[PDB]
Amino acid sequence: LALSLTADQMVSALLDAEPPILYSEYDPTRPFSEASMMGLLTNLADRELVHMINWAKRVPGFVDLTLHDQVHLLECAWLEILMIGLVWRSMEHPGKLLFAPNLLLDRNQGKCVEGMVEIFDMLLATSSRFRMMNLQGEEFVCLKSIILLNSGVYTFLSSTLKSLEEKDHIHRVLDKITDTLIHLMAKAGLTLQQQHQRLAQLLLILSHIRHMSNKGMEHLYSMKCKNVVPLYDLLLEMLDAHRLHA
Amino acid sequence: LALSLTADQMVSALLDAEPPILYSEYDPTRPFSEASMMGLLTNLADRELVHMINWAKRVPGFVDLTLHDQVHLLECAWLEILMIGLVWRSMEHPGKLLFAPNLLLDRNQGKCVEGMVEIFDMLLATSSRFRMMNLQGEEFVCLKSIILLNSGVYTFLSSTLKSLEEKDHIHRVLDKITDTLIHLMAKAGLTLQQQHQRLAQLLLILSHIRHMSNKGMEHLYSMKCKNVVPLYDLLLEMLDAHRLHA
Ligand SMILES: CC/C(=C(\c1ccc(O)cc1)c1ccc(OCCN(C)C)cc1)c1ccccc1
Ligand SMILES: CC/C(=C(\c1ccc(O)cc1)c1ccc(OCCN(C)C)cc1)c1ccccc1
């Protein structure tokens, strides 16, 4: 039961579920000018998605939900989740975005990546904010978890009895993550006021991540494929797994 | 000095700055089928904007900022501010959106308003959430203020000394509003844990309001005018006021 976990149990659970940092797929020995930035990012995102699924399934309370709800939450939050991870790893690289350990781009270079005319600078600003706030890994994982659960909680299908139970559960887990964040801050020696203030500062950044995701999706949709299986179905295929590999 | 205000002083200040509820402009005696929903909403929004300016100038700390920064914050947050007001007044009208006291539309009716294919339902969901949470007016005004100050704090021009001072001031005011929200909750008899949890629940709703604003702007831009003075300049004209009427 995810609702019985203690703060320390929540943090350890989340830290343990952290996905790996992937590398971009390209010939390091071959010219950089040849590669396509969007092709590289698209390929990176596609590989990260599989791992994101694995991660989501390990976020306490997520698997307690229905398959359809798990799919909806991920379809809503996937890009925000990729972006917050990106901002996090770019924290110690002022002026640059570490898309991957072998793919670090600066402002000027960004000016040439399609669909990033506005968001590159927004992402840098967010990374800078995390740096000023001295965001901790324990805090980062709670935030990423909040995004996954909060993403599409208010865009759910209907109001069936099961749907009401689902929403309630999500809000209870979210409440548990808030408690965890406060605990982490209390442990760090922050005063009560400093605790409330930091919690708020952190949650307000999530509105900026949503903004960046919306702007990114606007571009991705403006170059949408044709007869390509919908994200929903791909997520479903990956989420709707059997236990034959148990 | 807005930074010296007490919680009770902050709330009274915000409540006092509340803008009036405007009416839609149309012949109540004439057929409804004749009017254009987007024309009505556009005309309503335009009139609300002037009053929003007046309101912003009365949000503690806002006028301490530069004119250019005041304009940037409003250009980023204006639609979120209109939307949160809309959700707030539709709170006691399940299944309907009270665009104005003389303009209440239900789901089915929304299905016919351009640009609202997705956001109508999202707005209803938000109103429903506020209802379940039993959101208070004192809380609502703090939230609207947070939107105004948080909106474009991370999309500011450069990093000049003045810009760094500006950002710091905004974050200090935001911190003061957080304290105010916690105070309001403590006064309502909520426990410390219930306080942190509610603060988080309220701030997470702001990410959904940002989402709705982005979707709305997507449509508005898809029907953008030509030789029409940019929003920035209109906001500037309204904000850059003289004191000859003092
Ligand atoms: C911010 C970089 C980025 C992507 C990205 C972000 C973080 C990360 O870890 C990896 C990639 C990005 C780019 C493309 C993309 O494609 C997904 C859609 N495919 C399935 C067609 C996803 C993310 C992007 C998104 C929208 C527009 C421009 C760039
Ligand atoms: C949600 C209703 C709405 C508007 C609205 C919201 C709250 C409120 O109090 C009043 C209106 C809306 C519609 C049009 C609009 O136009 C502004 C641009 N003009 C200057 C060209 C602004 C808001 C809207 C926005 C985008 C798409 C579809 C509808």
Q: How many residues does chain B have?
A: 246
Q: To what resolution in angstroms was this structure determined?
A: 1.9
Pair of tokens at residue B105:
């539309």
- B185, B12 contact by CB (below 8 A): no
Q: Does A215 touch chain B (CB under 8 A)?
A: yes
Nearest chain B Cα distance for residue A128, angstroms = 9
> Taking CB atoms and an 8 Å limit, are A196 and B197 in contact across chains?
no
CA of B73 to the centre of ligand 2 (A): 18
> Taking CB atoms and an 8 Å limit, are B203 and A201 in contact across chains?
no
Contacts of A201 in chain B (CB under 8 A): 171, 174-175, 178
- B53, B19 contact by CB (below 8 A): no
3-state class (DSSP) for residue B117: coil
Q: Does B222 touch chain A (CB under 8 A)?
A: no
What whole-number distance in Å separates Cα of residue A141 and Cα of residue B5? 35
- B56, B148 contact by CB (below 8 A): yes
Q: Does B168 touch chain A (CB under 8 A)?
A: no
Count of structural domains within chain B: 1
Q: Is A211 annotated as a binding residue?
A: no
Q: Where are the alpha helices (DSSP H) in B20-66?
A: 37-56
Pick B218's closest partner by Cβ from A121, A129, A218.
A218
3-state class (DSSP) for residue A170: helix
Smallest Cα–Cα separation from A67: which of A245, A244, A232, A243?
A: A232
Which B-chain residues 11-70 have CB contacts (< 8 A) with chain A? Answer: none
Q: Does A136 touch chain B (CB under 8 A)?
A: no
> Taking CB atoms and an 8 Å limit, are B200 and A178 in contact across chains?
yes
In one-letter notation, the amino acid at residue B63 is V
CA of B209 to the centre of ligand 1 (A): 23
3-state class (DSSP) for residue B31: coil
Q: Does A212 touch chain B (CB under 8 A)?
A: no
Report the relative pairing of strands A96-100 and A103-106 from DSSP bridges: antiparallel
Pair of tokens at residue B153:
């704090």
Nearest chain A Cα distance for residue B181, angstroms = 10
- Placement of tokens 């999500």 in the chain: A170
CA of A32 to the centre of ligand 1 (A): 19
Nearest protein Cα to ligand 1, atom 27:
A216
Contacts of A195 in chain B (CB under 8 A): 196
In one-letter notation, the amino acid at residue A49 is L
Query: How many CA atoms lie less than 13 Å away from B81 in the CB half-sphere?
Result: 28
Q: Is A48 in the pocket of ligand 1 (CB under 6 A)?
A: yes
Q: Does B175 touch chain A (CB under 8 A)?
A: yes
| Four-point Cα dihedral B92, B201, B140, B125, nearest 10 | -30
The residue segments making up the domain with residue B191 are 1-246
Report the largest interatomic distance among the alpha carbons of chain B, rounded to a whole angstrom: 58
> Taking CB atoms and an 8 Å limit, are A175 and B201 in contact across chains?
yes
Pair of tokens at residue A58:
């390990």
3-state class (DSSP) for residue A127: helix
What whole-number distance in Å separates Cα of residue B216 and Cα of residue A42? 27
Smallest Cα–Cα separation from A130: which of A80, A84, A183?
A: A84
**What CATH code is carried by the domain that includes residue A191?**
1.10.565.10
- Placement of tokens 């299944």 in the chain: B95
> Taking CB atoms and an 8 Å limit, are A211 and B215 in contact across chains?
no
Q: Which ligand is nearest to the CA of A44?
A: 1
Method: X-ray
Distances from the Cα of A217 to the Cα of A125, A145, A220, B9, angstroms: 19, 20, 5, 42
Contacts of B150 in chain A (CB under 8 A): 204, 207
- B74, B53 contact by CB (below 8 A): yes
What whole-number distance in Å separates Cα of residue B122 and Cα of residue A60? 27
Nearest chain B Cα distance for residue A204, angstroms = 7
Pair of tokens at residue B112:
């016919």
Pick B178's closest partner by Cβ from A126, A155, A197.
A197
Q: DSSP states of A175-222 as a string? A: HHHHHHHHHHHHHTT--HHHHHHHHHHHHHHHHHHHHHHHHHHHHHHT
Annotated binding site of B: 48, 89, 219
> Taking CB atoms and an 8 Å limit, are A125 and B154 in contact across chains?
yes
Phi, psi of A191 (to 5 degrees): -75, 165
Nearest protein Cα to ligand 2, atom 2:
B41
> Taking CB atoms and an 8 Å limit, are A178 and B196 in contact across chains?
yes
Burial class (CB in 10 A: 0-12, 13-18, 19+), A64: middle
